[PDB]
Design a protein around this ligand. Sequence first.
Ligand SMILES: OC[C@H]1O[C@@H](O[C@@H]2[C@@H](O)[C@H](O[C@@H]3[C@@H](O)[C@H](O[C@@H]4[C@@H](O)[C@H](O[C@@H]5[C@@H](O)[C@H](O[C@@H]6[C@@H](O)[C@H](O)O[C@H](CO)[C@H]6O)O[C@H](CO)[C@H]5O)O[C@H](CO)[C@H]4O)O[C@H](CO)[C@H]3O)O[C@H](CO)[C@H]2O)[C@H](O)[C@@H](O)[C@@H]1O
Length: 100
Amino acid sequence: SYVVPSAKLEAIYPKGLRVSIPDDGFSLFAFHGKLNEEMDGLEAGHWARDITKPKEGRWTFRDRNVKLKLGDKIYFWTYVIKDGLGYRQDNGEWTVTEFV
Ligand SMILES: OC[C@H]1O[C@@H](O[C@@H]2[C@@H](O)[C@H](O[C@@H]3[C@@H](O)[C@H](O[C@@H]4[C@@H](O)[C@H](O[C@@H]5[C@@H](O)[C@H](O[C@@H]6[C@@H](O)[C@H](O)O[C@H](CO)[C@H]6O)O[C@H](CO)[C@H]5O)O[C@H](CO)[C@H]4O)O[C@H](CO)[C@H]3O)O[C@H](CO)[C@H]2O)[C@H](O)[C@@H](O)[C@@H]1O
């Protein structure tokens, strides 16, 4: 019913991944994703992590170590708890087009 804010993904140079969303009175944010490999629905994913506090208005997940390449695909879903209830951005797809 409620629509989760779309995730913003960023390929960091020379290495790393950041994934974040603005907060909307949430109590948790989780990111589930794979590298160049499609998700079979709500599988856990290669990256699979609960984030438990926001900072500067955003919920941020990072992998400080992945070396991403132009053209890399990330398939994902996110999960958010708002007022004790869960919501998902489903069927996420992102292509690395630039580094930040
Ligand atoms: O110590 C024991 C054990 O603990 C584990 O750690 C816990 C940890 O895994 C947990 O992490 C949270 C995670 O579970 C949660 O995942 C949810 C997921 O549960 C949800 O799954 C749904 C099912 O709920 C649903 O079941 C249906 C049910 O709702 C309905 O009422 O009845 C149906 C019966 O007819 C039943 O089928 O079925 C659907 C499939 O159709 C599932 O998809 O899905 C959501 C996504 O929608 C998913 O997010 O997410 C939380 C937030 O990210 C996680 O934090 O957290 C616990 C702490 O709170 C931990 O204790 C360990 O892993 C084990 O090793 C330990 O032994």
